[PDB]
Design a protein around this nucleic acid. Structure first.
Ligand SMILES: [Cl-]
Ligand SMILES: [Cl-]
Lengths: 75, 74, 75, 75
DNA sequence: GTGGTCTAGACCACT
DNA sequence: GTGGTCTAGACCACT
C-alpha cells in the first residue's frame, strides 16, 4: 500500500479504498487480523488516529470488526 | 455537567447529557447546538473529545451536521 | 499589526505586506511558527478564508511553508 | 535500569524500586516526564499492564502524577 | 467561523 | 501489545 500525502484526497479515505480492494480480493483473509493500527501508522508515516478514521469507517460499513485488547479483523 | 475523573469516558458522558436534553425539549428538532469549539472550551476538554460524542449521535441519527455551518438536532 | 476594513486595498493583501515586513526584519523568525490562522482571523475580526488567501500567497512565493497538523513556518 | 524476569521478585516491584532510586538521586526530577509506559514495556519486553502496576503504585504513594494524553511526571 | 482532517504523541482497558 | 480514549493544538474545505 502507498498513500499520497499531497493529494487533496484525505489520507484516511485513500487507506479505506486500498483496504477495500484487499478485502474484496482475499489479500486480507476473513477472521484473520489486520496489521495493528500502530503498524499501519508506522508504515504510512502518519498519525494513528488517521489510520483509525479509516478503520472505524470500515467497521461501520461492516467490512471489519474489532476485538478489544486483541485486534482488527476482516468480517 | 461532566466528571473528567470518572472511569466513564468523557465523550459518553456528553452523549448521555445531550440525549437527556433532547428528550425534555431543552433541545428540539432543527435548533443549533453550540459549536464544537464552544463545547470544548465549556468543558475544558479537547475538541476531538467533543467530536467523538457528536459523531456518535450523528451516526445514531439524533443529530445532523451541515458542513461549514453547524450541528443541529434531528 | 493593523488592518483597514474600508480600504479598497484587499484585506488579504494588507496582511501579506505586513507579514513580509515582519519576515524581513525577523519579528517572524525563520523556521518558527506564525500565529495560527485562527489567531489572525480572531484578532482582525475576519474570515479564516481571508487569512488563508494571504498565507497561501506567501507559501506560493516561497516565503512560508506549511506542515499539516502543526503550523505555518517561515522558510 | 535493569530487571530480572526470572527472579521471584515481581517485575512491577523491581521497576518501582529502581524508579525510586532514580528519583532519589535526581535522575528523574519534579514535573519532568518519565519515559512512556510504552518505552518501559518495549525495552524490557513486558506487557504495558506490568509497567502500569508499578506506575500506579508510585502514583498512589504520591511520588508520581499522571496527566491524561500528556505523560507521567515526578510529583 | 463552522465542521473536516491531521499531528505526535500520551495513558487506559483488557484474555 | 492490542484497540480505546485523550491531549492541545494546527491547517483545510466551505455558502
Ligand atoms: Cl482551530
Ligand atoms: Cl502507544
Amino acid at each position: 500500500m502507498n498513500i499520497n500525502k499531497q493529494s487533496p484526497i484525505p489520507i484516511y479515505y485513500q487507506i479505506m479504498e486500498q483496504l477495500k480492494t484487499q478485502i474484496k480480493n482475499g489479500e486480507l483473509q476473513p477472521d484473520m487480523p489486520l496489521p495493528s493500527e500502530r503498524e499501519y501508522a508506522e508504515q504510512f508515516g502518519i498519525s494513528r488516529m488517521t489510520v483509525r478514521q479509516a478503520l472505524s469507517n470500515l467497521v461501520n460499513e461492516g467490512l471489519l470488526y474489532r476485538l478489544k485488547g486483541r485486534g482488527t479483523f476482516v468480517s
